[PDB]
């Protein structure tokens, strides 16, 4: 019954009439798909549609939502399947666009690089309408939110198995699990892994993940699997000798005391915003800091230990839905990731046992009415779980 991983074609056919609920009559959206694969999801979300050259157009001719129509154009089934009401060859685009752009008042399309977005532009009142996508995919579906809960689960138990193993160097720690992700039953990297070992954690950007590992640090990786389109995204630091030294610990437990402490705020009847959450991990973690004695170290103030946001809307894309207002209250529905962070620079003002030490602890979200649900529970965090995974099995 499904058309994409967790989606079924009814549920893609109410996406479109929800859209089609906002539109003045004679609208028609148009939304060019990607080249050669990631397709382009606002396209992926409304239609499942995952091939290249491809050119959707959603058209309101009356107010009766029963006028609507669902065109499509394909390379050389889409309306058996996926449901379109017309359909034409790609190559078809010069002729067949033409006639509904004309009969038309209102074209909703972005004017800011796919091939048939070029062409699309230079036959071009005129709309955007990414951003009243964005708004729907902000709210996540029940389907949806059961897809992403999958997505965690696989990749948090991929997590857990790579904690009973020793790795003496970080690709086999990130080919590892890339092989768990998919074998577990994803598709694909959510996003390009980052395997950090000891001071590579404090590169935020580090991606290289082939240095050697040693039995004195700490490894910090940020990796997760996509199933269906739909992406996880995980953080998890742990030592690489299997048992925390008293140093990783007491700086462990600030970043999961954070962590911890601002995902207990994610109940929409808080009312709080994803910024409102952050400026209270900043409040929190200089806090720790101050319990570490570190908090007032000269040059060195919480924005630059803890130097990035507390976590990102999560869905199609890993950072997902960025158009939308980071200052209104989270909604029911929403998925957002929380992954604070500590990183202590090489600085002979901090105690030599905190120099060079990174620690960042992510887990994905969703908002609940009176409550949340941690998508990615199974990852064990908590130091007594992870000695005990990593020491036992
Ligand atoms: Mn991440
Ligand atoms: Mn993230």
Known sequence: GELTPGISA???????????????????????????????????????????????????????????????????????????????????????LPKIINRNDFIYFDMLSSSNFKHIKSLLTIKPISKRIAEFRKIKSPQELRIMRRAGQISGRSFNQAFAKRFRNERTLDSFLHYKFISGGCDKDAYIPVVATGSNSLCIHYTRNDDVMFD??????????????????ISRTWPNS?????????????????????????????????????????????????????????????????????????????????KVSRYEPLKVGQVITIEPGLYIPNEESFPSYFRNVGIRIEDDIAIGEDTYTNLTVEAVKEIDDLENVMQNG
């Open 10 to 96: 009814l549920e893609y056919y109410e996406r479109r009439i929800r859209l089609a609920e906002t539109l003045p009559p004679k609208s028609c959206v148009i939304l060019a798909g990607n080249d050669i694969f990631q397709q382009e999801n606002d396209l992926f979300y409304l239609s499942g549609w995952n091939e290249p050259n491809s050119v959707m157009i959603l058209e309101k001719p009356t107010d009766s939502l029963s006028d609507t129509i669902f065109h499509m154009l394909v390379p050389p089934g889409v309306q058996e399947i996926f449901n379109a009401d017309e359909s034409a060859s790609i190559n078809d685009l010069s002729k067949y």
């Open 242 to 322: 299997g048992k925390f030294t008293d140093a990783q610990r007491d700086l462990y437990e600030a970043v999961l005391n954070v962590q911890r402490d601002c995902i207990k705020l994610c109940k929409a009847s808080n009312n709080y915003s994803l910024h409102d959450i952050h400026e209270k991990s900043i409040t929190l973690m200089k806090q720790e800091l101050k319990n570490l004695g570190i908090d007032k170290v000269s040059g060195w103030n919480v924005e630059k230990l803890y130097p990035h946001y507390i976590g990102h809307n999560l869905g199609l894309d890993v950072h997902d839905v960025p």
């Open 216 to 233: 004195d640090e700490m490894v910090l990786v940020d990796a997760a699997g996509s199933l269906g389109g739909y992406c996880a995204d």
